[PDB]
Structure 1
Amino acid sequence: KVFGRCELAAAMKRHGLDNYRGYSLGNWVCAAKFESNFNTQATNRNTDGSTDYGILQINSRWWCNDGRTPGSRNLCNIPCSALLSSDITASVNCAKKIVSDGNGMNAWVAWRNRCKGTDVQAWIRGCRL
Protein backbone atom coordinates (compact mmCIF):
# COMPACT_ATOMS: atom_id res chain seq x y z
CA LYS A 1 0.00 0.00 0.00
CA VAL A 2 1.41 3.52 -0.78
CA PHE A 3 -0.25 5.86 1.75
CA GLY A 4 -1.03 9.45 1.19
CA ARG A 5 0.64 11.80 3.63
CA CYS A 6 -2.49 12.79 5.60
CA GLU A 7 -3.87 9.26 5.24
CA LEU A 8 -0.79 7.89 7.01
CA ALA A 9 -0.90 10.59 9.66
CA ALA A 10 -4.49 9.60 10.44
CA ALA A 11 -3.67 5.87 10.58
CA MET A 12 -0.71 6.52 12.88
CA LYS A 13 -2.89 8.63 15.19
CA ARG A 14 -5.60 5.93 15.17
CA HIS A 15 -2.93 3.49 16.40
CA GLY A 16 -1.70 5.78 19.20
CA LEU A 17 1.60 6.93 17.73
CA ASP A 18 0.85 10.63 17.98
CA ASN A 19 3.00 11.96 20.84
CA TYR A 20 4.12 8.42 21.75
CA ARG A 21 7.25 8.73 23.96
CA GLY A 22 6.92 12.47 23.37
CA TYR A 23 7.31 12.31 19.58
CA SER A 24 4.66 14.36 17.82
CA LEU A 25 2.87 12.92 14.82
CA GLY A 26 4.92 14.88 12.27
CA ASN A 27 8.08 13.14 13.51
CA TRP A 28 6.56 9.77 12.64
CA VAL A 29 5.27 10.90 9.25
CA CYS A 30 8.66 12.46 8.42
CA ALA A 31 10.44 9.24 9.39
CA ALA A 32 8.09 7.17 7.22
CA LYS A 33 8.57 9.54 4.28
CA PHE A 34 12.33 9.11 4.24
CA GLU A 35 12.35 5.43 5.26
CA SER A 36 9.80 4.13 2.75
CA ASN A 37 8.21 7.00 0.81
CA PHE A 38 5.00 5.86 2.55
CA ASN A 39 5.13 2.40 0.88
CA THR A 40 4.26 -0.48 3.21
CA GLN A 41 6.01 -2.94 0.85
CA ALA A 42 9.42 -1.25 1.03
CA THR A 43 12.38 -3.54 1.79
CA ASN A 44 16.08 -2.85 1.85
CA ARG A 45 19.02 -5.19 2.45
CA ASN A 46 21.80 -4.06 4.81
CA THR A 47 25.50 -4.82 4.33
CA ASP A 48 25.37 -6.99 7.49
CA GLY A 49 22.78 -9.29 5.83
CA SER A 50 19.82 -7.99 7.85
CA THR A 51 16.84 -6.46 6.04
CA ASP A 52 14.61 -3.45 6.81
CA TYR A 53 10.86 -3.87 6.30
CA GLY A 54 7.81 -1.69 5.83
CA ILE A 55 6.79 1.89 6.24
CA LEU A 56 9.28 2.48 9.09
CA GLN A 57 12.02 0.18 7.75
CA ILE A 58 12.20 -2.00 10.86
CA ASN A 59 15.28 -4.19 10.91
CA SER A 60 15.50 -7.99 11.22
CA ARG A 61 18.70 -7.87 13.33
CA TRP A 62 16.65 -7.14 16.43
CA TRP A 63 12.97 -6.72 15.82
CA CYS A 64 11.38 -9.33 13.52
CA ASN A 65 12.03 -12.81 12.17
CA ASP A 66 12.86 -13.37 8.50
CA GLY A 67 14.75 -16.68 8.87
CA ARG A 68 17.81 -15.25 7.04
CA THR A 69 19.56 -12.98 9.59
CA PRO A 70 22.07 -15.15 11.52
CA GLY A 71 22.35 -14.39 15.21
CA SER A 72 19.38 -12.04 15.18
CA ARG A 73 16.51 -11.51 17.59
CA ASN A 74 12.77 -11.08 17.09
CA LEU A 75 11.89 -8.65 19.88
CA CYS A 76 8.53 -7.64 18.36
CA ASN A 77 7.61 -11.35 18.11
CA ILE A 78 6.45 -11.12 14.47
CA PRO A 79 7.44 -12.36 11.04
CA CYS A 80 9.08 -9.50 9.15
CA SER A 81 6.44 -9.98 6.43
CA ALA A 82 3.80 -8.62 8.87
CA LEU A 83 5.56 -5.29 8.52
CA LEU A 84 4.65 -5.14 4.80
CA SER A 85 0.87 -5.31 5.26
CA SER A 86 -1.51 -2.60 4.10
CA ASP A 87 -2.65 -2.55 7.76
CA ILE A 88 0.03 -0.68 9.72
CA THR A 89 -0.82 -2.22 13.12
CA ALA A 90 2.24 -4.50 13.32
CA SER A 91 4.63 -1.74 12.21
CA VAL A 92 3.16 0.70 14.75
CA ASN A 93 3.23 -1.74 17.65
CA CYS A 94 6.82 -2.69 16.89
CA ALA A 95 7.86 0.95 16.45
CA LYS A 96 6.48 1.66 19.94
CA LYS A 97 8.90 -0.94 21.33
CA ILE A 98 11.83 0.40 19.29
CA VAL A 99 11.31 4.03 20.33
CA SER A 100 11.15 2.93 23.96
CA ASP A 101 14.55 1.15 23.78
CA GLY A 102 16.56 4.10 25.15
CA ASN A 103 17.59 6.19 22.12
CA GLY A 104 14.17 7.44 21.16
CA MET A 105 13.71 8.12 17.47
CA ASN A 106 17.50 8.16 16.96
CA ALA A 107 16.98 4.42 16.41
CA TRP A 108 15.95 5.51 12.88
CA VAL A 109 19.15 6.99 11.44
CA ALA A 110 17.11 8.69 8.68
CA TRP A 111 14.97 10.42 11.34
CA ARG A 112 18.14 11.73 12.97
CA ASN A 113 19.61 12.85 9.65
CA ARG A 114 16.52 14.22 7.89
CA CYS A 115 13.80 15.00 10.45
CA LYS A 116 15.40 15.85 13.81
CA GLY A 117 15.76 19.62 14.16
CA THR A 118 13.42 20.39 11.29
CA ASP A 119 9.86 21.71 11.09
CA VAL A 120 8.32 18.27 11.32
CA GLN A 121 4.82 19.70 11.85
CA ALA A 122 4.88 20.54 8.12
CA TRP A 123 4.31 16.81 7.51
CA ILE A 124 0.85 16.96 9.12
CA ARG A 125 -0.03 20.56 8.21
CA GLY A 126 -3.39 20.88 6.53
CA CYS A 127 -4.50 17.34 7.36
CA ARG A 128 -7.91 16.71 8.95
CA LEU A 129 -6.80 14.83 12.06
Structure 2
Amino acid sequence: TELTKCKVSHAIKDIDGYQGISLLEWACVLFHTSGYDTQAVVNDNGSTEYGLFQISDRFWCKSSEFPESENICGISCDKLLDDELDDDIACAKKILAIKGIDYWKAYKPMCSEKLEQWRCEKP
Protein backbone atom coordinates (compact mmCIF):
# COMPACT_ATOMS: atom_id res chain seq x y z
CA THR A 1 0.00 0.00 0.00
CA GLU A 2 1.69 3.17 -1.27
CA LEU A 3 1.03 5.91 1.28
CA THR A 4 1.98 9.59 0.99
CA LYS A 5 3.97 12.09 3.00
CA CYS A 6 0.91 13.30 4.90
CA LYS A 7 -0.62 9.89 5.53
CA VAL A 8 2.77 8.84 6.86
CA SER A 9 3.04 11.89 9.08
CA HIS A 10 -0.44 11.29 10.35
CA ALA A 11 -0.02 7.60 11.21
CA ILE A 12 3.40 8.24 12.71
CA LYS A 13 2.50 11.03 15.16
CA ASP A 14 3.37 8.81 18.14
CA ILE A 15 7.06 8.35 17.25
CA ASP A 16 7.74 12.08 16.97
CA GLY A 17 10.71 13.29 18.99
CA TYR A 18 11.69 9.87 20.31
CA GLN A 19 15.46 9.63 20.32
CA GLY A 20 15.61 13.22 19.02
CA ILE A 21 14.11 12.41 15.62
CA SER A 22 11.33 14.73 14.34
CA LEU A 23 8.55 13.90 11.90
CA LEU A 24 10.38 15.99 9.26
CA GLU A 25 13.37 13.71 9.47
CA TRP A 26 11.10 10.65 9.48
CA ALA A 27 9.18 11.53 6.30
CA CYS A 28 12.52 12.22 4.70
CA VAL A 29 13.92 8.90 5.91
CA LEU A 30 10.84 6.89 5.07
CA PHE A 31 10.59 8.34 1.59
CA HIS A 32 14.11 7.18 0.76
CA THR A 33 13.83 4.02 2.78
CA SER A 34 10.49 2.64 1.54
CA GLY A 35 8.87 5.15 -0.75
CA TYR A 36 6.22 5.07 1.94
CA ASP A 37 5.17 1.62 0.82
CA THR A 38 3.87 -0.42 3.75
CA GLN A 39 4.38 -3.63 1.76
CA ALA A 40 7.91 -2.78 0.69
CA VAL A 41 10.14 -5.86 0.78
CA VAL A 42 13.80 -5.53 -0.17
CA ASN A 43 16.32 -8.30 -0.15
CA ASP A 44 19.72 -7.08 0.91
CA ASN A 45 22.30 -9.77 1.55
CA GLY A 46 20.97 -12.92 3.14
CA SER A 47 18.34 -10.90 4.98
CA THR A 48 15.11 -9.16 4.01
CA GLU A 49 13.84 -5.77 5.15
CA TYR A 50 10.14 -5.18 5.78
CA GLY A 51 7.57 -2.48 5.37
CA LEU A 52 7.53 1.25 5.66
CA PHE A 53 10.61 1.22 7.98
CA GLN A 54 12.40 -1.64 6.24
CA ILE A 55 12.98 -3.56 9.47
CA SER A 56 15.40 -6.44 8.91
CA ASP A 57 14.61 -10.06 9.68
CA ARG A 58 18.30 -10.56 10.51
CA PHE A 59 17.86 -9.26 14.10
CA TRP A 60 14.52 -7.52 14.44
CA CYS A 61 11.70 -9.85 13.42
CA LYS A 62 11.02 -13.52 12.86
CA SER A 63 10.55 -14.44 9.22
CA SER A 64 9.64 -17.80 7.76
CA GLU A 65 13.15 -17.97 6.29
CA PHE A 66 15.06 -16.87 9.40
CA PRO A 67 13.52 -18.85 12.34
CA GLU A 68 16.66 -18.26 14.43
CA SER A 69 16.62 -14.47 14.27
CA GLU A 70 16.90 -12.94 17.75
CA ASN A 71 13.62 -11.40 16.68
CA ILE A 72 14.38 -8.50 19.02
CA CYS A 73 11.03 -6.95 18.35
CA GLY A 74 9.27 -10.24 18.95
CA ILE A 75 7.04 -10.02 15.89
CA SER A 76 6.47 -11.86 12.67
CA CYS A 77 8.07 -9.84 9.87
CA ASP A 78 4.84 -10.37 7.86
CA LYS A 79 2.94 -8.20 10.38
CA LEU A 80 5.11 -5.38 9.07
CA LEU A 81 3.58 -5.69 5.60
CA ASP A 82 -0.02 -4.81 6.46
CA ASP A 83 -1.48 -1.34 6.90
CA GLU A 84 -1.43 -1.22 10.68
CA LEU A 85 1.70 0.65 11.63
CA ASP A 86 1.50 0.49 15.43
CA ASP A 87 3.68 -2.58 15.67
CA ASP A 88 6.07 -1.21 12.98
CA ILE A 89 6.35 1.93 15.05
CA ALA A 90 6.95 0.04 18.28
CA CYS A 91 9.67 -1.97 16.71
CA ALA A 92 11.21 1.10 15.17
CA LYS A 93 11.20 2.54 18.65
CA LYS A 94 13.28 -0.40 19.80
CA ILE A 95 15.72 -0.01 16.94
CA LEU A 96 16.23 3.64 17.91
CA ALA A 97 16.90 2.90 21.59
CA ILE A 98 19.24 -0.01 20.89
CA LYS A 99 21.02 0.97 17.65
CA GLY A 100 20.01 4.57 16.99
CA ILE A 101 18.83 6.45 13.89
CA ASP A 102 21.75 5.19 11.82
CA TYR A 103 20.11 1.85 11.32
CA TRP A 104 18.35 3.85 8.60
CA LYS A 105 21.18 4.58 6.24
CA ALA A 106 19.25 7.23 4.32
CA TYR A 107 19.39 9.42 7.41
CA LYS A 108 22.89 10.88 7.24
CA PRO A 109 23.20 11.35 3.47
CA MET A 110 19.64 12.52 2.59
CA CYS A 111 18.21 13.87 5.76
CA SER A 112 20.91 16.05 7.32
CA GLU A 113 19.81 19.29 5.69
CA LYS A 114 16.75 20.91 4.15
CA LEU A 115 14.08 19.39 6.36
CA GLU A 116 11.61 22.21 6.01
CA GLN A 117 10.37 20.66 2.74
CA TRP A 118 9.31 17.40 4.42
CA ARG A 119 6.51 18.84 6.55
CA CYS A 120 2.93 17.89 5.82
CA GLU A 121 1.16 21.13 4.75
CA LYS A 122 -2.22 19.77 5.70
CA PRO A 123 -4.19 19.40 8.93
TM-score (normalised: structure 2): 0.92
Unmatched segments (≥5 aa) in structure 1: none
1:73-121 CA-partner distances (Å, limit 9, x unpaired): 100000000111111111101000001114x211111222221x21223
- 1:110 counterpart = 2:106: yes
Tell me, yes or no, if the aligned pair for 2:34 and 2:52 is still in contact at 8 Å: yes
The ranges of structure 1 where at least 4 consecutive aligned residues each deviate by more than 3 angstroms after the TM superposition are none
Cα 1:121–1:18 change in 2 (3 A) is farther
User: Between the two proteins, what is the percent identity of the paired residues?
Assistant: 34
Cα offset for 1:127? 3.0
Q: Distance in 2 between matches of 1:41 and 1:79?
A: 14
Aligned length: 123
Q: CA RMSD in A?
A: 1.4
Gaps of 5+ in 2: none
Write the mapping of 1:1-129 to structure 2, written as runs, cut at 5 A: 1-13=1-13, 16-47=14-45, 49-69=46-66, 71-102=68-99, 104-115=100-111, 117-128=112-123
CA deviations on 1:3-39 (whole Å, 9 max, x unpaired) are 12111101100xx111111111111111110111011
Q: TM-score, normalised by structure 1?
A: 0.88
> Is the contact between residue 39 and residue 51 of structure 2 (CA under 8 Å) also seen in structure 1?
yes
> In 2, distance between residues paired with 1:125 and 1:42?
22
